[PDB]
Paper text:
The function of the hook is a universal joint that transmits motor torque to the filament in any orientation relative to the motor axis. The distal rod and hook show distinct mechanical properties, although they share the same helical symmetry and repeat distance and are composed of similar subunit proteins ([name] and FlgE) with 39% sequence identity.
Here, we have constructed an atomic model of the St-rod structure on the basis of the crystal structure of a core fragment of St-[name] (FlgG20) solved at 2.0 Å resolution in combination with the previous cryoEM map. The N-terminal 33 and C-terminal 3 residues of mol A and 25 residues of mol B were not traced because of poor electron density. FlgG20 more closely resembles Cj-FlgE than the core fragment of St-FlgE. The β-stretch composed of the N- and C- terminal chains of FlgG20 (N85–T89 and Y218–T221, respectively) fits nicely on the corresponding regions of Cj-FlgE.
Residue numbers in the entry: 80 to 224
Write the structure that this text describes.
């Protein structure tokens, strides 16, 4: 496995902590894939869900421009609320990617990591299944691991 950090509650909807194994998958500015535990989410200039570093989550998730709030469930379901509408509208699925050897991941800076020969191939799964951890919106993973 890898070293889990302690989950502190911030109540910020942008913060999504991972409880257990897995990394968020993002697309680097050059088109390649990277991975991170930094669940600090955002909406880029075209409604795409991105991380704190500004990197688009992979696969792409589009947030409607009229979305009032974004909810990310423990299973990774991404939904939004819209004015006067009672039911939440699901807009995407946030996946968690696991590796055989997290130590083998290469740091590329900004809390991002990429797949290496030592890390093994990525295993993309739903949060909660196949060893992948769970997502806790409003929580941060503290670096005091």
């Amino acid at each position: 496995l890898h070293s889990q950090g302690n989950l502190s509650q911030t109540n910020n909807s942008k913060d999504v902590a991972i409880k257990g194994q897995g990394f968020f998958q993002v697309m680097l500015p050059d088109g390649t894939s990277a991975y991170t535990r930094d669940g600090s989410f955002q909406v880029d200039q075209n409604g795409q869900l991105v991380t704190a570093g500004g990197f688009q989550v992979q696969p792409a998730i589009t947030i409607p421009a009229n979305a009032l709030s974004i909810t990310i469930g423990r299973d990774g379901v991404v939904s939004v609320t819209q004015q006067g509408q009672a039911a939440p509208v699901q807009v995407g699925q946030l996946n968690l990617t696991t590796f055989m050897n997290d130590t083998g991941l290469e740091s590329i800076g900004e809390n991002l990591y990429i797949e290496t020969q030592s890390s093994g191939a990525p295993n993309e799964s739903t949060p909660g299944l196949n060893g992948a951890g769970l997502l806790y919106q409003g929580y941060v993973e503290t670096s005091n691991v």
